[PDB]
Structure 1
Amino acid sequence: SKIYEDNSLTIGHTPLVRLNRIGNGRILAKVESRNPSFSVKCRIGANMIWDAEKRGVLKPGVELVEPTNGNTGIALAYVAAARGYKLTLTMPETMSIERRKLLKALGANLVLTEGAKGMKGAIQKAEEIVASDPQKYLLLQQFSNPANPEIHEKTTGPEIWEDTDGQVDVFISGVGTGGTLTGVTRYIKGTKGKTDLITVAVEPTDSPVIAQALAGEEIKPGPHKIQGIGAGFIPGNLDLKLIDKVVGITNEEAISTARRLMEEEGILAGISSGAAVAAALKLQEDESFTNKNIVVILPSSGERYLSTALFADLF
């Protein structure tokens, strides 16, 4: 039989679909919205909590706290509800009412911080709360907790190797916390020894922090609209030495390519999914990439961004 004890155990095994109209027919898309709370974060939500239980730092009585309202907040919320923990999320008071209803329905406690203070303010409040009683509260820290890239090394990477029978030549991943790129690459180049794999990091042209860092230049971030990637600094969970190439993508390229995924392939896709695919299209303009099999990660579904520019001016 195959009966899951709780929803956090259903993560992974997402499909690899060939794109037929976008590109030359060799781009293979991994659909991470096929997860329990519908995004690639479902995997780390589950693993960061399972990891804390195994280390003995998470048990009944200990509450969770994290400064985030994006896909990671949604993922932590369904896992905490599924396994019986209380969760507090801090975020700017400017946050969509849509997002807040969803998080609240999953039972999360929402602590809204000063709009003018942005993310730094949310992060601030989260630390005050945990300092208030360090035995009662546990902060997970998605950008540096090793349990994040660990789940990708244990599930995402193996799924990709298996589904392509090891025929993957290029791996493309837009970077947010960096866990996906780091974990999958460690498994393929490290564990399976395919050192000739080309790992491509994708980021906003408007906040090319990874390209800067790799060239030894100063880190100068900027605002952009590709939700989910380009945090503006180099995350502890991003292993810079595993990267072979970085590709910068514009807001317009990301949005228009996300739209082609929905209209031409029938795959609901968010803005960052368009950015990763637009990167594959650029590489295919170079003849050395002509006959290579390219695997790209599609992080989330367009349905979660119905209020953004992704859907603006359709009629």
Structure 2
Amino acid sequence: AIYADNSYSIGNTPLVRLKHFGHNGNVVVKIEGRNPSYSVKCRIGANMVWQAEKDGTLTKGKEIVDATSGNTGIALAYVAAARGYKITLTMPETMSLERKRLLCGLGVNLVLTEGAKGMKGAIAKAEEIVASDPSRYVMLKQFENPANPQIHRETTGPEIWKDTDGKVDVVVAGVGTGGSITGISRAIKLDFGKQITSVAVEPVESPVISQTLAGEEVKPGPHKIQGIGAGFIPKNLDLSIIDRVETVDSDTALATARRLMAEEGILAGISSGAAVAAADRLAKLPEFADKLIVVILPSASERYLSTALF
């Protein structure tokens, strides 16, 4: 069909079988880079806006505000542009020129916050703008907004089910907001009734899900796996449906993403390398020898040209 605007075109991303990972082709990857603004977040940027429309919290002339300049910020920016909303994004002044350029290109009103305050300062400024005129501004809250996992239950999950003819046995996904693994797992286990293994992936540098589930002190840390390892348990991570948690280190995530590019011709982002590294570890366990492992690849390589990836 013909999509009425770019937001409706989300999803329907392909599955590709890996040749240099897994055992006898048991690892398949879902390419979320193939989306309106080239990441998995396109789905949630679309659905958070759509749901805010449906529930009346977002109306014509109201303005979106957020403190993300990562994939979610980019996603919200294309959706705002596609649907005629003004959007303000806050971010530390020390964010890259490429990212400022991208966001400005999409028509975002960028508000640069004090470098020394980091993300905390950007978040406080966003909250400040909203509080200044609550009837004018809407903050969509990707870590807690149920529209995030819901779109994965409605689209991402069913796509995996359909494209594997119900043969999927394991889903492996890095956790940022938790929305992907949560929605996918709800779709497959609850809507399609299949008892799969749901595998959350987090950085070994900030293994807060592992520490939490073990009853150990939660000690977040810095890492380079952009998009995952938020340093807390997000509301959109449904721990009830998580079967296993795999930790992967930043160097290995980067090396793996580089291998995806050079050995598979898949232009994967950093966190995609993390998810595949975790999946390859499971794929080479005899217990998973005859099992179909589907891995989410959240983003694409060109978004990382200025990073350690290249």
TM range (shorter): over 0.9
Amino acid at match of 2:21: I
Aligned counterpart, 2:171: 171
In the alignment, does 2:95 pair up with 1:108? no
Q: Separation in 2 of the partners of 1:132 and 1:37?
A: 30
**Is the Cα–Cα contact under 8 Å of residues 22 and 284 in structure 2 kept in the other structure?**
no
Aligned counterpart, 2:4: 5
Q: Separation in 2 of the partners of 1:50 and 1:35?
A: 17
Give deviations 1:42-84, integer Å, cap 9, x for gaps: 0000000000110111111210001100000100001100110
Aligned counterpart, 1:131: 131
Q: Aligned to 1:200, what secondary structure does the other structure show?
A: strand
* Structure 1 segments (4+ residues) deviating >2 Å: none
Give deviations 1:99-124, integer Å, cap 9, x for gaps: 00000010000011111111111110
Aligned counterpart, 1:31: 31
Give deviations 1:224-270, integer Å, cap 9, x for gaps: 00001000000010011111100100111101110111011111011
Q: Separation in 1 of the partners of 2:104 and 2:271?
A: 25
In the alignment, does 2:78 pair up with 1:73? no
In the alignment, does 2:288 pair up with 1:306? no
* Aligned-pair CA distance for 1:285: 3.2
Aligned counterpart, 1:273: 272
* Aligned-pair CA distance for 1:215: 1.1
Amino acid at match of 1:260: R
Q: Aligned to 1:309, what secondary structure does the other structure show?
A: coil
Q: What is the number of residues matched between the two proteins?
A: 309
Q: Separation in 2 of the partners of 1:223 and 1:145?
A: 25
**Is the Cα–Cα contact under 8 Å of residues 22 and 260 in structure 1 kept in the other structure?**
no
* Aligned-pair CA distance for 1:190: 1.0
Q: Aligned to 2:168, what secondary structure does the other structure show?
A: coil
* Aligned-pair CA distance for 1:21: 1.9
Q: Separation in 2 of the partners of 1:11 and 1:233?
A: 28
Aligned counterpart, 1:160: 160
With the length of structure 2 as denominator, give the TM-score of the two structures.
Answer: 0.98
Q: Aligned to 1:103, what secondary structure does the other structure show?
A: helix
Which runs of no fewer than 5 residues in structure 1 stay unpaired?
A: none
Q: Separation in 2 of the partners of 1:4 and 1:188?
A: 27
Aligned counterpart, 2:286: 287
In the alignment, does 2:229 pair up with 1:205? no
Q: Separation in 1 of the partners of 2:29 and 2:284?
A: 19
Aligned counterpart, 2:146: 146
Give deviations 1:250-302, integer Å, cap 9, x for gaps: 11110111011101111101110000000011113321111111000000001
Greater mean alpha carbon deviation, residues 280-289 or residues 235-244: 280-289
Aligned counterpart, 1:227: 226
Aligned counterpart, 2:252: 253
Aligned counterpart, 2:98: 98
* Aligned-pair CA distance for 1:168: 0.5
* Aligned-pair CA distance for 1:207: 0.2
Give deviations 1:124-144, integer Å, cap 9, x for gaps: 001110000100001110000
* Aligned-pair CA distance for 1:192: 1.3
Aligned counterpart, 2:262: 263
Q: Aligned to 2:210, what secondary structure does the other structure show?
A: helix
Amino acid at match of 1:152: H
Aligned counterpart, 1:186: 186
Q: Separation in 2 of the partners of 1:75 and 1:152?
A: 15
Aligned counterpart, 1:45: 45
Give deviations 1:139-162, integer Å, cap 9, x for gaps: 110000010000000000000001
Amino acid at match of 2:213: L
Amino acid at match of 1:309: A
